[PDB]
């Protein structure tokens, strides 16, 4: 056992590793989206920039989780980062909807993690999740919902002008 | 009687209290609108910002009226701030039209107040209304009329693109 | 259902709306106090300034709650802001005592809200309450208790000199 | 009962007093260590500086707990600060190990305190512990574990050169 | 024997350790006073600040004595820091009187220490006491006497207004 | 076919995708190493920092390759990022040796890619590889070889002091 480990259940350690893999997967999904919008036949540079920023933020989340795993005396166990479900989205609106679904899945995983930490009476882990992940997830979900709403109201995906103007005015 | 009271009719004091309540009600209507446009399914951030600014300005108007009530030796008598007539507006254009109607109602109340002060031969009250409220109301009504005209000409409310572009270019 | 709503119980949404109304009511009570101390026959300018600042802070609390309601996909439902129980306090000490009672009532409501969020397993809501409201309430209650203690020890309310000196030295 | 006391159980008040005494004891243990390494026959100035800083931080923790006791309307009850178990450590590595054990004991006490506050449904106390003490304890334990690991790997305590170089490069 | 020890009698070493414990005890008495005046039902913030500063100064005195013990090749032997005789003082004047009595006791101990060092022909120890402690004690006693005199003349402890004004004007 | 595609063979596109996956895999290996050295029982902070920087650089290399894929009209096809072969290295020297082997493998892949581009008469691809990857690989391999040589000469892995001093002086 680690000399620093205290009140750190093995179930919590395993769930933290699963969350690390989930954050890495989300980052790599966002990377796929970003370079989809960099394509010559899509060419929405601000969508690409937005999703690249999201990918970097997800990477940061993963790194923070690994740092906590080491802080608590757990052992990081990495797994394959699976390829994203889609190589194509055919519209900025569809990518935003997929991002919203992904963020909600990540949020559900974080909520299950918080429930596990509460059951294991690990207040440090609960506070870590609450302070660094829960409100960030809520803000991200709200922002993506706003983007989806605006794109739908503007006439996307059937209107390329809508996506162009959204790229220029909201994401630019 | 207050040691500072001079040429301050009780009718004027009561009308000032009614105007205080009206300004508070207008502020709270604007607050309702502002957070309607903050909703995920509406997501017009500049409409929300505009109406929040209007709410703060209305609060300021109310506070100025209370300060005058104290200056003249009147006694502030507060009443319930009634909830706004609408929880929903379904478009920025409808909210702008409602704001225009509200500002015209506030203006009519101020004009009746000025007529009362003129009848009571209260030149200080008349000058206070003229200097701090009448031209502000005229400017607000003109600005709201301009917004309504532009939104209607752009194709609102049937065109979500119109409201999006108006949010970006006029209110942003 | 809102596209962003996740782990947000309807009971929590209703309690948040009730808390919004409570914060608005507290702000309007503080406003009443502030302009009571602006009266010519009371004339305690720093008491008025203190209570006006408290009113603005309460308004901010209400706005933050509305923002959370929108963030979580809840729907803001506003109600009448009831007039304050008192139009008169006859002393700074009595106003401070009333403010202490009001802040304790707001705190009790927030604690019940936190208990509801804990029962509904809404860690984001629990953390929001803890981070933005609970310690602010504790600090406000402590400060008001200190003010009440100092005013009582100085000889208020029977000593106008006590309230004058407290206005100058503590609130100024 | 205190005019500010609300949702503050007597058991929580007693546990807070016990934690105050524990933090003071930890500070005084660290002080003992610091001046052990200031001895002419030990002469590890950066170890002394490190433990003096730790002592000051522990004092700060105690003061924060006393401030909370007053904020919540509890009554501070001080007890004797017992002398540290050891007047001698014969090596920097042994002092680091003792500090690690002490910090883990303090952490266990804080976790028991958080469990008590959770049982008493005192969310303000729970959030105070989580925000100001739990992650600080985790970071301190991790840092001490790192120091112990590095000292052991460098050849301490049998190698005075190891402790000298660690004093110069890690603690300096 | 220490390689640096020279003209350092064991009696002087023991007396220095006793003085270390006395300074720590005085610091902890001052800490108790400081947080007594932070209570909601006392609420004299400048009294609390004054006594907290005194506590920090006493801690500094203790640390200086420990540093001298190490400089001369003596060995620091710590003892329990006993809890202060009083948990309550019921007035700023009573706390000032207690502080005056405490400082006079510390001064008497320092004078006995100087007499011992003179008897042992330890000019370095005599000069250390004279330079760093004797005039500081005289100044502290004079300042506390001034505070006690002013509080008594102002009508303390029977006049809460006196203590409030003294807190604002002398300690603020 | 892409409107921008010109002199871009499908074999080159596939090899670029394979290289993207290889760079991502190398980044994730470096990430694993970095957080291995962040462990409490390893505690070599500058090794961790060095490998984290290497991971970020590898990510940058991958992103540059994806950007080229889009520039030339190829289509990015992502694959699973496989977990690193090792979760443990038991020494900084072993991690450096593994990094050297990994960089040589990446270099061999880049050389095969350059040979393919030369065979396909794709001078733009050849120049891209030469300008952005070949000399970077040579420099990285040389630096890792230097680190391995220095660690071996200092007595690693059997000497923890060697790895500590290397962490402080070369990587710090
Ligand atoms: Cu994330
Ligand atoms: Cu107005
Ligand atoms: Cu509030
Ligand atoms: Cu501590
Ligand atoms: Cu002293
Ligand atoms: Cu590379």
User: Under a CB-based contact definition with an 8 Å cutoff, are residues B100 and B150 in contact?
Assistant: no
Reported as half-sphere exposure (CB side, CA atoms, 13 A), residue A164 has a value of 5
Q: What is the DSSP string of C57-126?
A: HHHHHHHHHHHHHHHTT-------BPPPS-S--SSHHHHHHHHHHHHHHHHHHHHHHHHHHHHTT-HHHH
* CA nearest to F76, candidates F1, F20, F5: F20
Mutation target to probe the C interface, by most C beta carbons within 10 A, among A104, A138, A143 is: A138
Q: Residue D103, annotated ligand binder?
A: yes
CA B43, B45, B46, B49 torsion-angle sign: positive
Long-range contacts of D51-54 (CB under 8 A, 24+ apart): D51/D95, D51/D99, D54/D30, D54/D99, D54/D140
CB atoms within 10 A of CB E88: 12
The continuous run of DSSP H or E covering F128 comes out as helix F123-129
Do E78 and D38 count as a contact with CB atoms less than 8 A apart?
no
Q: Which residues of E touch C153 (CB under 8 A)?
A: 160-161, 163-164
CB atoms within 10 A of CB F85: 10
Q: Cα separations (Å) of C145 from D70, D109, E164?
A: 11, 31, 15
E90 interfaces chain C, CB cutoff of 8 Å: no
C169 interfaces chain D, CB cutoff of 8 Å: no
Give contacts of C 109-168 with D, CB under 8 A.
111, 114-115, 118, 126, 129-131, 134-135, 137-139, 141-142, 144-145, 148-149
The continuous run of DSSP H or E covering E152 comes out as helix E135-154
Mutation target to probe the C interface, by most C beta carbons within 10 A, among D124, D131, D132, D134 is: D124
Taking the CA of residue D144 and the nearest CA in chain C, the distance in Å comes to 30
Instruction: Give the angle subtended at the CA of B116 by the CAs of B115 and B120, to the nearest 5°.
Output: 120
Resolution (Å units): 1.7
CB atoms within 10 A of CB B169: 12
Q: What is the DSSP string of D130-164?
A: IIIIIHHHHHHHHHHHHHHHHHHHHTTTT-HHHHH
Nearest to C127 among A108, A130, A148 (CB): A130
Q: Residue A57, annotated ligand binder?
A: no
Distance F132 CA to ligand 6 centre (A): 9
Do F32 and A2 count as a contact with CB atoms less than 8 A apart?
no
Nearest to F78 among A32, A69, A73 (CB): A32
Q: Which residues of D touch C96 (CB under 8 A)?
A: none
Do A3 and D100 count as a contact with CB atoms less than 8 A apart?
yes
B77 interfaces chain C, CB cutoff of 8 Å: yes
CB atoms within 10 A of CB B60: 12
Peptide bond into D37 cis (omega under 30): no
**How many Å apart are CA A69 and CA F87, to the nearest integer?**
14
Do A142 and B168 count as a contact with CB atoms less than 8 A apart?
no
Q: Which residues surround ligand 4, an ion (CB under 5 A)?
A: D 23, 58, 61
**How many Å apart are CA E150 and CA E170, to the nearest integer?**
9
* CA nearest to C155, candidates C71, C87, C93, C76: C93
**How many Å apart are CA B42 and CA B36, to the nearest integer?**
7
Q: Which residues of D touch C104 (CB under 8 A)?
A: 6
Q: Residue F137, annotated ligand binder?
A: yes
Q: Do chains B and F touch (3 or more CB pairs under 8 A)?
A: no
Distance C57 CA to ligand 3 centre (A): 7
CA D167, D171, D172, E1 torsion-angle sign: negative
Q: Which residues of D touch E3 (CB under 8 A)?
A: 40-41
List CB contacts of E99: < 8 A, sequence separation 6 or more: E29, E30, E33, E51, E54, E144
For C146, nearest residue in chain D (alpha carbons): D4
Structure token pair of residue A45: 């540079």
**How many Å apart are CA C141 and CA C147, to the nearest integer?**
10
Q: Which residues of F touch D166 (CB under 8 A)?
A: 164
Taking the CA of residue E78 and the nearest CA in chain C, the distance in Å comes to 38
Q: Which residues of C touch A105 (CB under 8 A)?
A: none
Instruction: Give the angle subtended at the CA of C19 by the CAs of C14 and C21, to the nearest 5°.
Output: 100
Q: What is the DSSP string of B81-117?
A: BPPPS-S--SSHHHHHHHHHHHHHHHHHHHHHHHHHH
Mutation target to probe the D interface, by most D beta carbons within 10 A, among C142, C148, C149, C152 is: C142
- Which ligand has the minimum distance to the alpha carbon of residue C99? 3
Structure token pair of residue D137: 């304890």
Residue recorded with tokens 């009140």:
A7
Experimental method: cryo-EM
Three-state DSSP state, E88: coil
Residue recorded with tokens 């305590």:
D157
* CA nearest to E37, candidates E83, E87, E106, E105: E87
Instruction: Give the angle subtended at the CA of D108 by the CAs of A121 and D71, to the nearest 5°.
Output: 90
8-state DSSP, A83: P
Burial of E10 from C-beta contacts in 10 A (0-12 / 13-18 / 19+): exposed
Q: Residue E137, annotated ligand binder?
A: yes
Taking the CA of residue C98 and the nearest CA in chain E, the distance in Å comes to 16
Q: Which residues of A touch C7 (CB under 8 A)?
A: 107-108, 111
CB atoms within 10 A of CB D115: 15
Nearest to F40 among A2, A31, A81 (CB): A2
Q: Which residues of A touch F31 (CB under 8 A)?
A: 63, 66, 78
CA B9, B12, B16, B18 torsion-angle sign: positive
Mutation target to probe the C interface, by most C beta carbons within 10 A, among E48, E161, E166, E171 is: E161
Residue recorded with tokens 């540059």:
F64
Q: Cα separations (Å) of E122 from E71, E125, E164, F26?
A: 14, 5, 48, 70
Q: Cα separations (Å) of E80 from A157, D85, E163?
A: 76, 11, 34
Distance B38 CA to ligand 1 centre (A): 24
* CA nearest to E132, candidates E70, E71, E68: E68
Do D76 and E87 count as a contact with CB atoms less than 8 A apart?
yes
Residue D81, beta-bridge partner list = E81
User: Under a CB-based contact definition with an 8 Å cutoff, are residues B73 and C40 in contact?
Assistant: yes
How would you label E144-155 residue by residue, b for 16+ Cβ within 10 Å and e otherwise? beebbebbeebe
F1 interfaces chain A, CB cutoff of 8 Å: no
Peptide bond into B157 cis (omega under 30): yes
Q: Which residues of B touch C84 (CB under 8 A)?
A: 78
* CA nearest to E143, candidates E18, E57, E31, E45: E57
User: Under a CB-based contact definition with an 8 Å cutoff, are residues C9 and C73 in contact?
Assistant: no
């Amino acid at each position: 056992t680690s000399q620093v480990r205290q009140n750190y259940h093995q179930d919590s350690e395993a769930a933290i590793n699963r969350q690390i893999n989930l954050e890495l997967y989300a980052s790599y999904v966002y990377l796929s989206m970003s370079y989809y919008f960099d394509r010559d036949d899509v060419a929405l540079k601000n969508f690409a920039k937005y999703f690249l920023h999201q990918s970097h933020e997800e990477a940061e989340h993963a790194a923070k989780l690994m740092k906590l795993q080491n802080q608590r005396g757990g052992r990081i166990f990495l797994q394959d980062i699976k390829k994203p479900d889609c190589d194509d989205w055919e519209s900025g609106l569809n990518a935003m909807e997929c991002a919203l679904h992904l963020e909600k899945n990540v949020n559900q995983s974080l909520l299950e993690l918080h429930k596990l930490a509460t059951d294991k009476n690990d207040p440090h882990l609960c506070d870590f999740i609450e302070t660094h992940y829960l409100n960030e997830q809520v803000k991200a979900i709200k922002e993506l919902g706003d983007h989806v709403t605006n794109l739908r109201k503007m006439g996307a995906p059937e209107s390329g002008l809508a996506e162009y103007l959204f790229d220029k005015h909201t994401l630019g």
